[PDB]
Design a protein around this ligand. Structure first.
Ligand SMILES: [Mg+2]
Lengths: 301, 73, 73, 43, 339
RNA sequence: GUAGG
């Protein structure tokens, strides 16, 4: 229990027996032995109790051998995690993920292949690490195909930089990736990272860059009170019209309720026909459009 | 006093240290007869470091241009 | 510049078979005029090349190639 | 406003405050720029 | 899924920690963060009840150990004599018998070495069994496994925040207060001073209705989204508060721990995973209260909830006792006499 | 960072 828990993790690895060919092939023989033992146990057919306990013991020994391989190869994952560190995910977290990939590879390995476990494993370990780096590294979650598109175009653009010794023109990048310039700009803009608010901007007193930028959800009191005066004047101007006329226009434009009613929709509560209400709505349009009830509303827009 | 040359050299030195570790890693993970000086080096650390020194660094300061004297000072 | 290149010894693998020598560095005229750089928001830099020599004892051959590290402010 | 009692918040209290829970590290979609489901910023 | 303890109450002055469990800060540091074991509970009455039986089993074990050791010594002597006699009869060289006898006695010494090492192992495990008590730390994991193997169903042990949570759930603070009052009535020196400090905290817990188990939080709240805005920024860029990153870290690690616990996994990996979860939670509440902080982008440490509420730039002294105000202005001031 | 208070 110390600071920099990665050092504690390496101490937790400790000294464990590295396995020579005979050792791990024998261990895997015991693994498949325990596998068959648990397969027999799982069968609903009745087995003698002593035989079942023997099979359980064999399976437990197999589990211990699995653990031995895990601990022996813990050193292998730590090296592979270092091979991918420094890309926005923490080192021991990468080591944990590589350990998961190792668990997968170990669960999916046998001596049927005439090779060492490590060569087979390197593939699964890199698979798990790259998956997690694509799925959990960025603040914004980028899909795997998008991750490979962006890193492919990035590496090939870097290759163009090294080759030409100059910034490749976007059309060159588009033909290289074979996609259109539109996709190029799309993925390029999709391939950024946020800048944190809690960063020193200028002096310490200025502090966070968060303070500098204004928001948008804030209700501007000027605009809100402008809208309030517009509402009051509009209601008064409607009251200037006849009662039925004002009511029908209000329903046609939802001045009492947020949803305006269609013409026929107004012709149910009032008892008027859709064309009658249409007609009087047009007459209200005529009555309001006079210069009389327009000077006040013109300045409100 | 660390005049400008030594500062820029220090940052270039850091960049070349990054380049050394990168190329060493590449050689540890590269096959013989497919290695060229053109291919093995990555120029990103050097350009990034010198860039990171001229932007976002206290000693790299905005040049005041109020007058010639403030210049020289 | 040549000093910082020199102190970087040629990289040696665990076998020590291979080495990269950075003998001579050189510059080229900047592409953009100073007025043009100021007007168009470009970092006034120049190309910096270096002759990297690959030498492997196992191959017993020397392969010289000029490489470009990046625009130098 | 008469007193600001402060003290240990038990697990039951935290559950009571919670209107739900979070299950993912997802924040928003890169393309729709909209909140994802059952993650951070989950509407 | 795996409980953790809340950073503030621990890893600090002894007033907030309060010595609520009579264990040194090193004990807690080496237990919570995974490293050393705890004996949460022991059926010491049960162990005391069956002492003659277990003592007889141990005696029989020693008796058979000595019997087989005597048999091994007899076999050693017979082997030595037989090889000496047969090589001296052979007479292949001048002194073959002396060399083979030297090898035989070296083998005998080595066998004695393993005899004494296993005897020592039995003795130490037995006296540790006789050294059982609650809140007992077991740093050596191999030793603890030996304890479990040699005898189970009598002692209960654990690791991490779970052990602490069980301890506090089972804790009887009233008896601690009583015995500490007794100690203060008749006590001298540093022990008395420690007891006085402890009395304060236990009485504070006892008079308060809340249970001490709040030390081990289980469900981590989350800041409302607006208060940690991922506000859009012009230019295709984004602005995020570090708390989003901390929450991403903690939820991710909890997800991975769920994934492990779901399948059958070893004890080492699950314990490391729980340690990682504890690290994430502690960083969330306090980044930098232990060792290097979570530097995030690497240029500077990541902000934390407690970090927000503290200091010159904190909430209290910058945004509750001093606020910007609408309807204000500023300008140079010049002298006008006729006013 | 750097100037004024
Ligand atoms: Mg003044």
């Amino acid at each position: 229990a110390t600071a920099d828990p990665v050092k504690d993790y390496l101490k937790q690895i400790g000294k464990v027996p590295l396995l020579n060919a005979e050792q791990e092939v024998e261990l895997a023989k015991r693994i498949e032995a325990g596998l068959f033992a648990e397969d027999k146990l799982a069968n609903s057919d009745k087995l003698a109790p002593k035989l079942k306990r023997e099979l359980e013991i064999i399976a437990e020994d197999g589990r211990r051998a699995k653990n031995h391989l895990l601990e022996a190869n813990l050193r292998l994952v730590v090296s592979l995690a270092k091979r991918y560190t420094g890309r926005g995910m923490l080192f021991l977290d990468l080591i944990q993920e590589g350990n998961l990939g190792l668990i997968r590879a170990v669960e999916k390995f046998d001596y049927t292949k005439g090779y060492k476990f490590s060569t087979y494993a390197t593939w699964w370990i890199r698979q798990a690490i790259t998956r997690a780096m694509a799925d959990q590294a960025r603040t914004i979650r980028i899909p795997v195909h998008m991750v490979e598109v962006i890193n492919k175009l990035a590496r090939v653009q870097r290759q163009m930089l090294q080759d030409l010794g100059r910034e490749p023109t976007p059309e060159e990048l588009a033909k290289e990736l074979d996609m259109t310039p539109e996709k190029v700009i799309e993925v390029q803009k999709y391939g950024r990272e946020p800048i944190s608010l809690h960063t020193p901007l200028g002096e310490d007193g200025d502090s966070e860059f968060g303070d500098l930028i204004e928001d948008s959800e804030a209700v501007v009191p000027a605009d809100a009170v402008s809208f309030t005066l517009l509402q009051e004047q509009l209601h008064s101007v409607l009251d200037t019209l006849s009662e039925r006329e004002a009511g029908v226009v209000s329903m046609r434009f939802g001045l009492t309720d947020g949803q305006p009613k269609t013409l026929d929709e107004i012709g149910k509560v009032y008892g008027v026909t859709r064309e009658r209400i249409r007609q009087i709505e047009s007459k209200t349009m005529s009555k309001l459009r006079h210069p009389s009830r327009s000077q006040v509303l013109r300045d409100y827009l | 006093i660390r005049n400008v040359g030594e500062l820029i050299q220090n940052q270039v030195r850091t960049g070349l240290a990054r380049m050394e570790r990168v190329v060493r890693e590449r050689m540890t993970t590269q096959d013989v007869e497919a290695i060229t000086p053109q291919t093995l080096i990555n120029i990103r650390p050097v350009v990034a470091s010198i860039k990171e020194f001229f932007g976002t660094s206290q000693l790299s300061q905005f040049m005041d241009q109020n007058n010639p004297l403030s210049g020289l000072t | 510049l040549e000093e910082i290149f020199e102190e970087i010894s040629p990289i040696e693998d665990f076998s020590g078979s291979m080495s990269l020598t950075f003998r001579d560095h050189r510059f080229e005229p900047p592409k953009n005029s100073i007025d043009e750089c100021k007007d168009r928001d470009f970092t006034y830099a120049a190309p910096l090349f270096v002759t990297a020599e690959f030498t492997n004892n196992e191959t017993g051959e020397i392969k010289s190639q000029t490489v470009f590290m990046g625009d130098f402010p | 406003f008469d007193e600001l009692r402060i003290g240990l918040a038990t697990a039951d209290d935290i559950r009571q405050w919670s209107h739900g829970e979070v299950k993912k590290p997802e924040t928003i979609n890169y393309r729709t720029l909209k909140p994802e489901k059952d993650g951070l910023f989950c509407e | 899924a795996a409980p953790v303890t809340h950073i503030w109450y621990f890893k600090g002055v002894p007033s907030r920690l309060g010595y609520l469990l009579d264990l040194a800060p090193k004990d807690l540091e080496k237990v919570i963060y995974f490293a050393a074991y705890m004996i949460t509970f022991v059926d010491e009455e049960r162990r005391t009840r069956d002492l003659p039986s277990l003592e007889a089993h141990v005696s029989v074990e020693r008796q058979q150990i000595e019997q087989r050791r005597d048999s091994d010594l007899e076999a050693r002597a017979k082997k030595l004599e037989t090889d000496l006699a047969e090589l001296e009869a052979e007479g292949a060289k001048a002194d073959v018998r002396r060399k083979v006898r030297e090898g035989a006695e070296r083998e005998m010494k080595q066998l004695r070495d393993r005899a004494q090492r296993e005897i020592d192992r039995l003795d130490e495990v037995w006296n540790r069994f006789k050294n059982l008590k609650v809140q007992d730390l077991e740093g050596d994991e191999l030793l603890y496994r030996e304890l479990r193997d040699r005898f189970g169903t009598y002692f209960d042990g654990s690791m991490g925040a779970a052990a602490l949570q069980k301890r506090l759930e089972s804790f009887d603070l009233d008896e601690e207060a009583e015995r500490l009052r007794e100690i203060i009535r008749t006590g001298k020196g540093q022990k008395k001073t420690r007891a006085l400090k402890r009395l304060k905290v236990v009485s504070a817990f006892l008079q308060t209705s809340n249970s001490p188990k709040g030390m081990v939080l289980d469900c981590v709240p989350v800041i409302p989204p607006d208060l940690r805005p991922m506000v859009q920024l012009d230019g295709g860029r984004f602005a995020t508060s570090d708390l989003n990153d901390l929450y991403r870290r903690v939820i991710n690690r909890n997800n991975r721990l769920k994934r492990l616990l779901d399948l059958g996994a070893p004890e080492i990996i699950v314990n490391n995973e729980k340690r990682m979860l504890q690290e994430a939670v502690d960083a969330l509440f306090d980044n930098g209260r232990r060792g290097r902080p979570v530097t995030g982008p690497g240029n500077r440490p990541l902000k934390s909830l407690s970090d927000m509420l503290k200091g010159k730039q904190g909430r209290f002294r910058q945004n509750l006792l001093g606020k910007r105000v609408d309807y204000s202005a500023r300008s140079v001031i010049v002298v006008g006499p006729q006013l």
